[PDB]
A paper describes a structure:
Assembly of ribosomes requires the transcription, folding, modification, and processing of ribosomal RNA (rRNA), and stable association of ribosomal proteins (RPs) facilitated by trans-acting assembly factors (AFs). The crystal structure of mature yeast ribosomes first revealed that the eukaryotic NPET is composed of rRNA from five out of six domains of 25S rRNA, and the RPs uL4 (rpL4), uL22 (rpL17), and eL39 (rpL39).
This indicates that lack of the L4 TD causes significant disruption in the composition of the immature NPET. Classes N1 and N2 closely resemble class R2 from the rpl4∆63–87 mutant, except that the ITS2 structure is absent in class N2. Class R2 particles are wild-type-like and likely progress to class R1 particles, which display a shifted rRNA helix H68 (gold) that prevents binding of Sda1 and progression to Nog2 state 2. Alternatively, some fraction of class R2 particles may progress past Nog2 state 2 to class R6, which displays aberrant conformations of multiple rRNA helices.
Residue numbers in the entry:
A (entry chain o): 88 to 216
B (entry chain t): 55 to 105, 127 to 322
C (entry chain G): 104 to 250
D (entry chain K): 34 to 51, 71 to 305
Write the structure that this text describes.
RNA sequence: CCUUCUCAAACAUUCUGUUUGGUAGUGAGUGAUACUCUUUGGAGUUAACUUGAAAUUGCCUUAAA
């Protein structure tokens, strides 16, 4: 048979886990909600998973909102078979950068570049030009 | 029921207002710190609109002035954010269709610019101030009873002779003077005045009133515009004329 | 608006220029029954809306079959006054979208896809299944107490 | 400059070995420095000076191609009521080029939404210019897919004057930005590559005194220390090494 | 079922000229070689090509009732 887990796709912008939960909790009491996001500058990958309690709230939600058309992306939602046990899509945040350095005294890198000049020259020699 | 479209639209509008307030606040703070090299524009502006409508734009250069604020609603989806809710709850400006006085100075410009899309601002004449004073405006009192969680209407000038005789303020015409002249600190007076409560423009839902509502919304949408530009001037409409219909 | 564009073209036909070609192309719905049946079999109609309550039903009883035949996106709507509102009649009994503006192509495409997923597929049973064999209240309680 | 000519001649050798075809011979120049602007991104493009513009050969060079060189101008949403297309047709062919499509800022928010149509519109275009008062708003109306390219970006022009519209100003700047300037962005990190063009277009005997001025101008701006040359495949040519720039890495902190 | 940051100052006159500053996105996938720092932690950038906003699990209330 099927699970109690439901899967949604083709969500619009600005429709994140908060509003997903707030809306779908109008069909019962939900266990968990997870949405897909990015690793760097987390933005919505436009799908996610939910699961309330009963094996019938899932079918009610699907039958109700399978081809539902809100802001101009018509939604899609499927019921899952026994298990499949949603596992991932931890919620990320925008990746602020921090300068890692500088630590090494400029002299060994100066030797590095004084070598790299002729290193490039030999690379283009064998290429060869 | 909730009907997910509503909660989606509220989120979107709220994020817009959130980041607009973020922009304008960070810009104002960066101007205030005077490390002003990586900036956007030099000075600030004010835009006056008269009646398909003629406009101006001029620098402030304060020189304080006496401004009148009246609270309005919108726009249409915005779950009001904390920094604007704070300023309004400080100006005692919950519960729209209400009016407050304010001493426009050079340091309030970083506040009205934040609260711009929720109020309407104006510099009215003396007639508006005086007529508002003697038609509305209430006072809280205490004597012989009445543990005073309760207000009254301002019949008497002896109540003023009592609660303000230290500053020689008697006979609320003197308070009208103090307001219209920005005189003895204006602040005890304003915090005495118990900010007003004006009546709506169209009360209705008949058949002829839906027409007045439609025309009012269309004219408002034409005139009152909200920029989301983080550099926008504050807009000045004729409150001398607005108080005719709102008083 | 008709008299106003007539006054404008009245001005322009002789003063600057117009051969009924100063005002742009008009885009509006098509709402006549003979007209829409002749607009199918052309074929130019892009979406047909058919009222579900015509009292002499045999006027529209044949439109879904011809629509599926000629391959036109038909959809059956609840109410004929509802249709007449967007045509400025009292009832209209059919409406058609034949050509749309530039900004509405995505809207019309997504809408016809929605109608495909919701009307064309949800109703493969409709072709069979004579409906209406419903018992009353007392007769039903009688049979349900018996069996 | 002896190094300039020898490196360009040897890159000509590199391409003279006996889509992909037009791709495999585009000359680009790499430059790096200490470190760029921290935690910030930039979107304004700086139009360097030149003596021999590479925009002007590109007209006849791309006319006979499939990429179909074209031009876009974005005016403010108030001057499409003032500046007609025959005015530009007259005032511009007398110089040699024409602006083709005037797209109002409203057509970015009404007809060219729905990113499929937006990109189907955007790919058609090669030289893009933008009202100076809308360029600040264009990242919301055109999206980062356009910014991901060096030529699709909107290029700010000083349409306004003191005072109002005066299409004479638009004219007297569009020449300066078609036959006098050369655009390039400034990203984070250190590396910046400049598209000089293809070895089908304008010649090395002008590329020499062009790179001379491009160097002479950029070398003083960001304390740069490394300038190399390549064409789409070739190993990097050392044409610059200034160690008198790496000295302040231990003086900053 | 909301709707997008659409000029600021200065020095100048040739009837418009010059310097400055202002711009963080729809996701997913394909893909060529080049660099900058830091210890192994792989971060910042780098020629360009596909898609009906496409998808499956990367560690305030008279804007009422």
């Amino acid at each position: 048979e099927y699970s109690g887990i439901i899967y949604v796709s083709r969500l619009p912008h600005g429709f994140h886990e908060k509003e997903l939960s707030k809306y779908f909790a109008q069909f019962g009491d939900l266990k968990e909600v997870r949405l897909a996001r990015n690793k760097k500058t987390g933005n919505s990958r436009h799908y996610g998973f939910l699961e309330f309690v009963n094996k019938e709230d899932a079918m009610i939600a699907q039958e109700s909102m399978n081809n539902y058309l809100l802001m101009g992306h018509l939604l899609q939602v499927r019921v899952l078979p026994k298990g499949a046990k949603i596992e991932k899509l931890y919620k990320y945040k925008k990746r602020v950068l921090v300068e890692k350095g500088i630590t090494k005294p400029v002299k060994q890198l100066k030797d590095n570049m004084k070598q790299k000049h002729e290193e490039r020259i030999k690379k283009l020699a064998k290429s060869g030009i | 029921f909730v009907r997910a479209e509503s909660i989606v639209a509220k989120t979107l509008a709220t994020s817009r207002e959130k980041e607009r307030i973020k922009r304008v606040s960070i810009l104002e703070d960066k101007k205030a710190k005077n490390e002003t090299q990586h900036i956007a524009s030099g000075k600030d502006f004010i835009l006056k609109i008269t009646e398909g409508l003629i406009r101006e734009k001029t620098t402030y250069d304060g020189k304080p002035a006496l401004l009148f604020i009246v609270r309005v609603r919108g726009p249409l989806a915005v779950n009001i954010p904390n920094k604007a809710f704070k300023i309004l709850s400080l100006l005692r400006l919950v519960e729209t269709n209400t009016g407050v006085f304010v001493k426009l100075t050079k340091n309030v410009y970083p506040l009205l610019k934040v609260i711009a899309p929720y109020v309407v601002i104006g510099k009215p004449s003396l007639s508006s101030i005086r007529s508002l004073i003697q038609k509305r405006g209430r006072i809280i009192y205490k004597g012989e009873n009445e543990a005073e969680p309760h207000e009254i209407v301002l019949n008497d000038n002896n109540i003023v002779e009592e609660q303000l005789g230290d500053h020689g303020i008697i006979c609320v015409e003197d308070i009208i003077h103090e307001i219209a002249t920005m005189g003895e600190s204006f602040s005890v007076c304003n915090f005495f005045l118990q900010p007003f409560k004006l009546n709506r423009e169209v009360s209705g839902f008949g058949s002829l009133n839906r027409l007045r509502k439609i025309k009012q919304r269309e004219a408002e949408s034409r005139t009152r515009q909200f920029s989301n530009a983080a550099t926008a001037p504050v807009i000045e409409v004729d409150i001398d004329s607005l108080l005719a219909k709102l008083n | 608006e008709k008299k106003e564009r007539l006054t404008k073209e009245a001005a322009a036909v002789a003063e600057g220029k117009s051969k009924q070609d100063a005002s742009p192309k008009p885009y509006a719905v098509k709402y006549g029954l003979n007209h829409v049946v002749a607009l199918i079999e052309n074929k130019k109609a892009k979406l047909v809306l058919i009222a579900n309550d015509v009292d002499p039903i045999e006027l529209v009883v044949f439109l879904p079959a011809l629509c599926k035949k000629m391959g036109v996106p038909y959809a059956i709507v609840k109410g004929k006054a509802r249709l007449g509102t967007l045509v400025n009649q009292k009832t209209s009994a059919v409406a058609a979208l034949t050509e749309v503006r530039a900004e509405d192509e995505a809207a019309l495409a997504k809408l016809v896809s929605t109608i495909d997923a919701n009307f064309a597929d949800k109703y493969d049973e409709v072709k069979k299944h004579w409906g209406g064999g419903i018992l009353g209240n007392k007769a039903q309680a009688k049979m349900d107490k018996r069996a | 400059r002896e190094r300039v000519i020898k490196a360009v001649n040897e890159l000509i050798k590199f391409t003279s070995k006996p889509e992909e075809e037009l791709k495999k011979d585009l000359q680009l120049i790499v430059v790096n420095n200490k470190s760029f602007t921290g935690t910030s991104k930039s979107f304004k493009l700086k139009l360097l000076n030149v003596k021999h513009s590479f925009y002007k050969p590109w007209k006849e060079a791309s006319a006979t191609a499939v990429k179909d060189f074209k031009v876009l101008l974005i005016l403010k949403d108030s001057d499409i009521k003032k500046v007609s297309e025959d005015d530009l047709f007259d005032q511009l062919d007398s110089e040699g080029i024409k602006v083709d499509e005037i797209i109002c800022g409203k057509d970015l928010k009404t007809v060219y939404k729905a990113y499929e149509a937006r990109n189907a519109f955007i790919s058609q275009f090669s030289l893009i210019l933008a009202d100076d008062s809308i360029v600040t708003s264009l990242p919301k109306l055109m999206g980062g897919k356009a910014y991901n390219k060096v030529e699709t970006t909107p290029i700010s022009i000083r349409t306004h004057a003191n005072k109002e519209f005066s299409l004479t100003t638009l004219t007297n700047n569009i020449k300066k930005v078609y036959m006098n300037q050369l655009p390039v962005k400034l990203p984070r990190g250190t590396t910046l590559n400049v598209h000089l063009g293809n070895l089908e277009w304008l010649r090395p005997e002008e590329f020499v005194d062009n790179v001379e001025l491009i160097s002479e101008q950029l070398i003083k701006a960001y304390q740069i220390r490394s300038i190399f040359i390549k064409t789409n495949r070739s190993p990097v040519l050392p044409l610059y090494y200034n160690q008198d720039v790496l000295d302040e890495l231990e003086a900053k902190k």
